[PDB]
């Protein structure tokens, strides 16, 4: 699949309003991950203890791991569909030394949007929301197909 320049513009313009907070934005959709799907949590072994909302706004931890997560994120999106590189690594670490099924990278897309539906509505209309999960279907697709490629099907 292939994205429209309208449909990168779309996404690029909502991602700048996240980068303005990124460690704010990583909170957010790391707790409504581990909410909506607490089995994720238990992939984390340096946060798999926490058990309530309020340990998880106050861990130092999390929200570096967060601003982690979404810089790596950030980047990918800004290739614009050419993001073979960044991948390879990706890829290889979430398929052989987390061990990440495809079924999760689905979660926390849902929680992704659930967070800038929810933070930016005036930059996330239903336009804005097809090109983002759009761009987050093709990171999935490309990500899974590096997962066959490696030997891991999850
Ligand atoms: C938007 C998709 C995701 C991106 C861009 C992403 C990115 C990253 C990055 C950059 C790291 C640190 C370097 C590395 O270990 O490769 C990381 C670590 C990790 N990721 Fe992800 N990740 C994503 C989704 C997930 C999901 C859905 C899970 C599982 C629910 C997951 C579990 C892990 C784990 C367990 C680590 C290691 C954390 C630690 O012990 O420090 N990741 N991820």
């Known amino acids: 699949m292939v994205l429209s320049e309208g449909e990168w513009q779309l996404v690029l313009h909502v991602w700048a309003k996240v ?8 909170q957010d959709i790391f707790i409504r991950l581990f909410k909506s799907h607490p089995e ?14 309020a340990e998880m706004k106050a861990s130092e931890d999390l929200k570096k791991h967060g601003v982690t997560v979404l810089t790596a994120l950030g980047a990918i999106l800004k290739k614009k569909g050419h993001h073979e590189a960044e991948l390879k690594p990706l ?8 061990k990440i099924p495809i079924k999760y990278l689905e979660f926390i897309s849902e929680a992704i949007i659930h967070v800038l539906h929810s933070r930016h509505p005036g930059n996330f209309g239903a336009d804005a929301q097809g090109a983002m999960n759009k761009a987050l279907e093709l990171f999935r697709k490309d990500i899974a197909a590096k997962y066959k490629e490696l030997g891991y099907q999850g």
Do not use: I, N, P
Not at 19 to 26: C, T
């Open 19 to 26: 980068e303005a907070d990124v460690a704010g934005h990583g």
């Open 40 to 53: 994720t949590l238990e992939k984390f072994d340096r946060f798999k203890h926490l058990k309530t909302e």
């Open 91 to 98: 890829a290889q670490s979430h398929a052989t030394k987390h």
